[model samples]
Target: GSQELKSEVFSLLNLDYPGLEKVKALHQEGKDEDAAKALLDYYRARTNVKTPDINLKKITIGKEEQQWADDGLKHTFFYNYGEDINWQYWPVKDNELRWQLHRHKWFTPMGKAYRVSGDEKYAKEWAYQYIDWIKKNPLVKMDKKEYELVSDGKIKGEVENVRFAWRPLEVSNRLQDQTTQFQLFLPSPSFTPDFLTEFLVNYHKHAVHILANYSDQGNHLLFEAQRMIYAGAFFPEFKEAPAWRKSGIDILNREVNVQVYNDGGQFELDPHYHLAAINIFCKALGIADVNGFRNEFPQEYLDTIEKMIMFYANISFPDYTNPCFSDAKITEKKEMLKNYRAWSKLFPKNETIKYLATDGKEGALPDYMSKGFLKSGFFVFRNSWGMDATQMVVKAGPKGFWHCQPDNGTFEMWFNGKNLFPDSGSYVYAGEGEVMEQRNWHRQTSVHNTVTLDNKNLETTESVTKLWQPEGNIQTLVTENPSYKNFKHRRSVFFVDNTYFVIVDEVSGSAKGSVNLHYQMPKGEIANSREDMTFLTQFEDGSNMKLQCFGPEGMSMKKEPGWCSTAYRKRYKRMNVSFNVKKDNENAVRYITVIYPVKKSADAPKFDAKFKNKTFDENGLEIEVKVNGKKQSLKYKL
Candidate 1:
């Protein structure tokens, strides 16, 4: 019966590929038996191709393969040596053998194969030899007294060693031997069930313990949730009854509801982790429901599952990566297909299943939402190398969606294939001392693509709240105005038609005013340009503004020579634009700089000064222009 079920499940595996045609052909003949036979054959073929049992013999070092094994061992040992141990709470040397636990599962079949083949040497080498080696080495004990105290006032013990507990237990369970199983027990044996019992009691105990302890905060909860699901699946004896079944179910439910946002984004803000967590949740729930534990939780669990699937379906790039967020190293189209297949297996008949087959960039929000105000239109801007495409261009909107980069009500422009306004890069704990400063610049307002008053950066003190996708491409976001004063700043529409981008910055309500627009560009793109220039000035009403340009080599700024300076190496260039503004209601200034690639030849055509439909070419590409009756336009080509 189990094999039959497996056959059916396997048939579902490659349905998205060539297998669908087989199903259709079988159905067309009007012979149900033939159709079923075809399905079974397809299932068997797929499983044979895709699912290979772990090869224990390949894991161990044989006499013929001794050189490769030894080399691998040496490389691992040296690699571990180079890791920093200052933060390690345990003795690194003692914990190095933690890899043994992962290898322990392989030993199970080796021991069985040896027993069946009447080879005592194989049994002794794989089962007894490794266990004896571990016993002799016996985790090197470090003096807890010498260990520095953590901020919590406890002796800093090796955190990595504590995490190694479950891996060994997992391996020991697979061996299914009395001695091995007993040794793998955690805390004490009294808490574990008998080794002879069909169920893996020790494995479940340690897994639940880890989940309960680690799921206290943030993304760690998702990790712990995954461990709980793994325990549920591997230790099925625990799932045979109600109480044991409830434990894993409870953890999964809490993780799904608490760790995931309503928009189906993970609360930890990690895209990779979010996907991983969803997969685990799906697997755990699938097993629980199949085992008759569905009623234990609300129907929302199923709804949440659908939402999570839809979230991935909608946000992932054409390549199945969520390029608009921090995608983990493991994201690939195959992985996306695996997730979709897993979801399909769980909800075989859901209507939204069609989305599972998509292969293109999705809109900023799901199709269900409306495209709201600030309809300048958004584009999926990616890195030139196509490595990172996590940033979205919200061509100026009134509202923002869930995970909207703290830039709503402001036109956001991203160039160079990264977040235009850099994110607070990876954070180091405050206890790490000077390392915290590396993250400091990222959290400040000055690092963003906006204006700050008197060149004062706004310190991030409040958590940014993003409204869920209220409509398509239009989501609302609100920032608690920083405690600082007189810093009135806003970004207008961001317009682009494949080639050029026009960003508008409107700043008002500043006293003792000076505006500095900082332009940060990659090093290779920077060059000695007679064309690239910055225009900065204060209107008669005291409103100050600055615009910097990165154009082709020939464009240069006339009248403002010292304004442009090479700073922070070639990575950063600054233009300080300041002008005395006489307070007047009608007085306002608009600065425009046109940026384009420069021609190498000196005889290249250049634009002259233009004023109110009148044109004059004086000193290259500088044009003093006026707009309407009050606003002034200072134009320069860069």
Candidate 2:
């Protein structure tokens, strides 16, 4: 049966040589050995010539690349390590560091150097390591629980054949890097026909391993599926290529719906993972389209992809940066713009996509000032689409499966091209001792811009939108979260005249403890921490925000030590402005907070926020805000 399939595949293969029929005949005649040899010769000849896409000039040989190339020649490999790197042995107990070494992404620098300099040693070193890796590490299969132990940094080292090198994610990532290295070194003399055959065999093995052992779900599964498609599209010589391609397509079609919500947000509920999901899905579609499988993806799939792209375009800040919420790291704005521009080519008529691609210079801007994804519990409020606009995002939703932090009912604010209030992003994925401890610290509730009880972590409950009134000059959003065993946090956000914000934090429950409201500022000092609980950022120029708070008597505000990480393995000190009140098992307590954005310090607003109903439990409330001598009476009903 397999022979028959290969014959079919070989017949369909466009060898573009005169011996195509001869190759097919050799396979049909059961001359398998000769057929394999002939196929290897064909691939060698095809690869011996330069691949048109492997442009050496475009290969960036940066300082990091040079260092990586030099270090790789010595068989040294480790990520984020200051100590001596040890290859072929476990020198470090850091699980994440070892995992990064196994990902083999550093091979790119080697490839880049080889492509530019035509260095045979670079290619030779790559091949040597490739073979050494294959011989050193054999694929090991483990159940989900066992895999979790290794992945979650629970198991420090491999013992009794329980290993980490051949993990599915590493395998997938290794395949990607290996494929690129293969392309970069194709024209080198070091990559002999024998080495090519060995490479192809192991490559197919990688695909088979991934196909048999797909991660249950989430971004990992998506990444695994992506490599499968890559294998099929890049090398259609093997008989199993068709099945591999079909398997990847099938998994993608099924998982896109299962992993992505109807509102186009990834189920992980992390913006970084969402962007990754988009890239994986889009790349799969690109491979399919380029390889003559364009019709394989259905209209529903395309529609969902469009919606996924729209999700980023809509929620992104004016500078094209997404909210660093829930384990998200900072991504380059240029990279995001490139994705949007490429997306515009796919959906040519989508003006919003075009607008994002062109950086708000062309196409139609988004029609609404306030947008909400109810299923994913993300709401965006902005005054305009320009770079100098005021925008904010509120996070409140279901407890996602993975990569989701326990910080709901929190929000991030961006004004005048600066993230004044950004989420404390995730630090590391896997590590040992203090590294892992710090990771957990970043995920705590108190670190986020939300309220916590007695400085304890909040229990995850599905957050709900109690009210969504996006009309007229005033827009309001009210969300509720049962964060504690007996307490519910209801946050009401009001946008006044598209200029400022007034927040009402209502905590109602039977629990007794100190209720603390948390807010984090970017890398800057507070200009003013007034005795009346009014805080101003020390930004002397451009835009600044003044935060004023009012709570029940005995409210005290203090600055707590805070840390924020915009990228992995990196963190900077920041300030955490916390307002605390001791609740003696109170049935209800409300805190009124105002966030006023201004162009100058002299332009700070005067706020007289009196409770029209005298208490939060009443029917309604009004906030009298006077900004630059302009007064606005904003009213809201509970």
Candidate 3:
């Protein structure tokens, strides 16, 4: 992969990690003196380094102080570290990678920090800590793994050597980080060569383990390939380099294709993870540039990543923040912008892509972008992609290959910066307490901006037609699923103006059950309660939004309290207003609801669209809104 990208690469040093071209080759040959100088020269021309607790944003390794202040890592994987602990018995977290995330080698930023200053004081100060971690996190066998083996040995029966730290992902990332970070100390007069020799054993073990146990799928596999690529890059002349390079590139290409949807949505469906993959992709491409893999990629690498950036552009609110949809947490895309803006330089004429990579890179798109991925099942429609745009991201499609939640026909809306109907984001990845609570409640169909019958959660998304409904300014999305026993539910959302949204829903069954149509809220407070379910509610900044719902009679309204997790590992209270129905109990049970967003202080067209008249046919549903005596209309089917 490196050899291939070497020629076609554009400005090898222009990416996130510049000076990589110089240091990468030198380190591979263990040329310490030259490598250290080049690394120092690069840092001199580039940014400063710090012994930080966070790298970019995704890499969060707590400091020694945070660990002690947080009460001695008692909950820190419940396994002892730095204390009298045995690696053979550390009750490792379910995601063994957690161990690697914390206190792992290779990511020892101290060494790199030492390089940035090349201070004798710095090198001496950190050396003790490095050995401290090394001694504490002893290398133990993984599961039924072998105690030791070199690259030349037999297969070793697919066993993994686990210490307190080591997995395919951790191992690979360690290799990548170690080679680069270790540059400072490799040439230190006081530094011992035996450390490198000791690590080589671990390196060979990790390579064999990674080679034997390739990541079958998901982010795991991609990082696996990345590790080996770095391994080959770190030791280009080694005997195992051939197999490592071949495996790395082959899997690298496959994962790139498999990881993204045809519509450019990442498989995980989390915006943060979506951007995370962009890093991996760009990192590998950067490696290719440095290592001379300058050939054409199997697919349009730039194009795919550009679309990914655009996807973020379209879905973001006016403030450049997106709802906490799926596992998406509130992340400031500083580094993500760096990666995107850097790539956009390759294509000057791609105006929209460039527009997305600017100062307000996280802000809302200022132009219309009606893009939908039919297979992946995500669709975004905006009256206009302006700062004051009225937009909604509706998920009528199905789940991804992994990491996406199940809330079909769920939708979130924003009026400029005002989040009208917001989806509850994620609290945690897995297990117990708040994690499962948010998982079950926040992901429930009734908790989103959609209709659910008999309190049933629409888990696996059923297919439907999601079209822009060309021929007019109108756009309509429809979803139908007959999975709820004998009852079949169908909902179609129609958008014609920034002020109005129409939800036409039908449930074809005589089953004796209640139906609920929920409208989630972000910052808006309920205006009318017992008497009027439709009233102008208070939004942010002393602003107000006109909210109303229209359907068959017998639909009582109630407030449903829920959670919205905008940041990682955290959640707060939110609300979901529900409209109910007793199907087969009310003849011709159908829903025609409306919402009118109001932000302008002047020339505000009204939200007085009380459904004056409605006609229903199996041919199927026709509805219009009476806004300021102007009837905006939509005609659709069952």
Candidate 4:
């Protein structure tokens, strides 16, 4: 199946002539699908489309003039993208160049659409462009544009693109998407094997460019390697094919081991990127398996995929949302699930890998995972595993490598299929001046539900403590922040009955240092604040939470406006209530916050809490919670 369709296309190649009568004769016989696909491979390479799978969508992208979203935002396909146009001010509306390089996504739809509907424009118009592209669209700095060096500092003097085809990533992705797109036209008259090799050699230059200058070690590098791996598997007869094969497998082996942590989380520390790594690695593995080159991949690669899938499952909450760390969004859950279900099929039923994908044998997945991750520093405390389950995740770990924000103590909770305090996502990479300033803010410590000292970010150091002590119906965690050198802080959170929270933030700094303890809510504004060291936050759902602080007397309570990126390049206002402790020559600013829920989402308000029976005897502690009466109490050794 793999090698049979090649030389047949070469037999029909004739100089100075179409010489494709054999393709029509083969079509008359109505035979092997791939043989026919090989001949028309040239045709598929010529066309391009806007979206990845535009046929699946309702509207015709280019034919419908221009498309607009439900919110009345307009963007079109007419582009001269050689310059770094002021796209930053507008974000997704003008970042057409970035979207153009994603892949030869339009190739399949355009090439297949023409043959099916007998349309001539798809095959005719783009033919000249494709031939000219192979000659012109290599690695050349056509004009000045935004570069990695100019933007952040990944690559030294990023190659400015004359067009989308000149970018190395676009080249790699185009190589990957078109390699398979060629097979769609297999055995067609125009897709001769000599014709195949002539155009395919151009992409060899692309693969070489990717291997030489992968630039970044995150998702981009992984994608680059995967692109070459699949391309090499499809074309082993090339003189460079052996080197490509070795490097492809070696890159996957090395990167998968380092990028996917031992506990299955990616080192980038973003869940969506973690999922993206899974999809790419799976694609590479699947192509190797389909082409009967299974041994090229190591045993660790398959095992790591299983672990990554489990990591995704473990961190995912009842609502199917993940930690939107760095440049990520909740919308990725759908694509992540699609990858899981698709890739799981390569293994056996019941979730275990069969002996080999080529066999029909099955195996059993007997065990389930716990609610926490130890190595990557993620701990999920949940009431149950059902849809109505409630959960709290304590976040403290190493700096998230490069894609990390300085959010150390931010925790997320789930109740009634919704998040209590969600991490605001990195809005968009396309911005300038003030908008980039906002992007920088989200990447720092301000957008999190944690403490800020003198309104500064927490240091991204590993001397942070995230210890957990769990008992039945109660989970307590002690997180220490040595990141702030001048003002070291410690926070202890206790979840009782999975209904209420007891948060203790203890900060010790020099005499002039002040600490602001922040509590971020889901939506809406602050209702009220009092001189008694308390504040009330009201949500759009008509539910309210009362936070009572029992530390400094004159500490101010105020609400501040925050920002949230719900999806990529999208944003909304978030309300954060800060209980500020202005430094006074005092015994460490301590806040023992009693967080009272609205009882539950549906139930009416019934309790107001106060602190009583506070006593410390010989480095030990005891306290009581008062709701019109002192009903619940606890004793502990400090």
Candidate 4 C-alpha lDDT tens digits along 1-638: 01123334333233122334544455457553543454454344433222222232342324422121111111121232222222112345544645363344455555454454444544442333344444434455523454523664223222433344445667777777666445444334444444454455565667777777765676677777877776676655445665776787888888888777788878777777777777788887777766667678888888888788777766776556776766768855465455555666644353433311212244433243225566676666676544556667767767676567777777777665667667777886657999888788777676687788766788644535445665655567666776576666677777767666777776765635667888766665545546555555555453346666766667887667877775877788877667788776645776777765562333423333333433213233345555545465543445
RMSD of 2: 7.0
Cα lDDT tens digits, model 1, 88-151, are 3234565645554333433333433443344444433342333332323222234455443433
For residue 18, give model 2's deviation from the true position in Å. 11
Global lDDT scores for all candidate models: 0.37, 0.75, 0.59, 0.59
Q: Which stretches of candidate 4 lie over 4 Å from their true place?
A: 1-106, 115-167, 192-194, 197-219, 236-243, 346-370, 428-430, 443-446, 509-512, 525-546, 596-638
Task: Give lDDT: candidate 3, residue 602.
Answer: 36
Q: Pick the candidate with the highest lDDT.
A: 2
Candidates 1 and 4, the one with greater TM-score: 4
Q: What's the TM-score of each model vs. the native?
A: 0.49, 0.79, 0.74, 0.72
- Candidate 2 residue 295 Cα shift, in angstroms, is 2.6
- Model 1 TM-score relative to the real fold: 0.49
Tens digit of lDDT per residue, candidate 2, span 188-213? 76666456556766777778878878
Candidate 4 overall Cα lDDT vs. reference? 0.59
lDDT of 3 by residue, 221-338 (tens): 8877876777665544345665786778778777767778867778777777887787676665555545555253445666676666666666665456775677787655575456
Candidate 2: residue pairs that collide: none
